[PDB]
């Protein structure tokens, strides 16, 4: 374990479990979880990876993911190629959380950091839950990695923090 910092290469062998979106908003119909190779996907283009302590919880819901959902158009305009939301919750719960927020497509993906394996390796996990952090990546290299330690804060991991750091770069 060591803190992941800007200028670092995003770690290798980072995989998440997730149910690819089918276009449905039906919470009662589960798909089939598969593997997502985050290291490979982030290797080209600009990526935004956000972790939340818990799906369906108040702040994680009413502030953090809502804020990103409200400004996809701004994120797209900024050149962001993919937005990922992870948590310790299993791939079924994460998929239902995405549906509950009206996400039917790949605009935001909802994946599981099983056993907080990735989050623990970068030092931002505790007691079976991921921390509240946000990583921005550009062609494999980390450009931003901050965790919100203050209870209820989204200052460092929220959408606006990601938009500002993006404005200091140019690519799609």
């Amino acid at each position: 374990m060591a803190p992941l910092q800007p200028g670092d290469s995003f770690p290798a062998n980072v995989v998440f479990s997730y149910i690819p979106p089918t276009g449905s908003l039906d919470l009662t119909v589960s798909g089939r979880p598969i593997e997502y190779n985050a290291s490979e996907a982030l290797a080209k283009g600009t990526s935004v990876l956000v972790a939340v302590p818990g799906a369906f919880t108040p702040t994680c819901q009413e502030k953090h993911v809502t804020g990103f959902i409200a400004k996809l158009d701004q994120l797209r305009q900024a050149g962001v190629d993919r937005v990922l939301f992870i948590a310790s919750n299993d791939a079924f719960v994460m998929s239902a959380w995405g549906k509950a927020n009206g996400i039917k497509d790949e605009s935001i993906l909802f994946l599981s950091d099983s056993d907080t394996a990735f989050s623990s390796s970068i030092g931002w996990a505790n007691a079976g839950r991921t921390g509240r952090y946000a990583i921005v990546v550009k062609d494999g290299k980390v450009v931003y990695a901050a965790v919100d330690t203050v209870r209820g804060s989204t200052e460092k991991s929220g959408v606006d923090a990601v938009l500002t750091v993006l404005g200091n770069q140019g690519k799609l």
């Binding site: 502030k63 203050v150 209820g152 804060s153 989204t154 606006d160």
Partner: protein, 104 residues
């Protein structure tokens, strides 16, 4: 050319927009830019431009109006009972903005 003193409180996570300081003292112009008695609408506007220490203004005011999900209590009274945004502020009023949304 007299002023009105008041105290404004921020709670429910709104305090994080003001470097975590809940209580603030403000002396308002008793008359606004059109010479009418100053109101909560003027206050909300003042707070968003002169008091916030966080750059995320949409967390408090959206499209020139207070963000939804914020209760406004005037001396412990819901501003819907006292007239919202049109209530003429009185001296030593206490105005409490509290977010019903968890966190910010």
């Amino acid at each position: 050319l007299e002023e009105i003193p008041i105290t404004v409180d921020f709670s429910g996570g709104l305090e994080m927009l003001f470097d975590n300081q809940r209580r603030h003292s403000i002396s308002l112009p008793a008359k606004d830019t059109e010479g009418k008695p100053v109101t909560i609408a003027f206050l909300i506007d003042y707070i968003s431009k002169k008091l916030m220490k966080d750059p995320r203004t949409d967390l408090f005011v959206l499209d020139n109006h207070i963000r939804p999900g914020i209760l406004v209590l005037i001396n412990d009274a819901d501003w819907e009972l006292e007239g919202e945004e049109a209530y003429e502020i009185q001296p030593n009023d206490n105005i409490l903005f509290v977010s019903t949304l968890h966190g910010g």
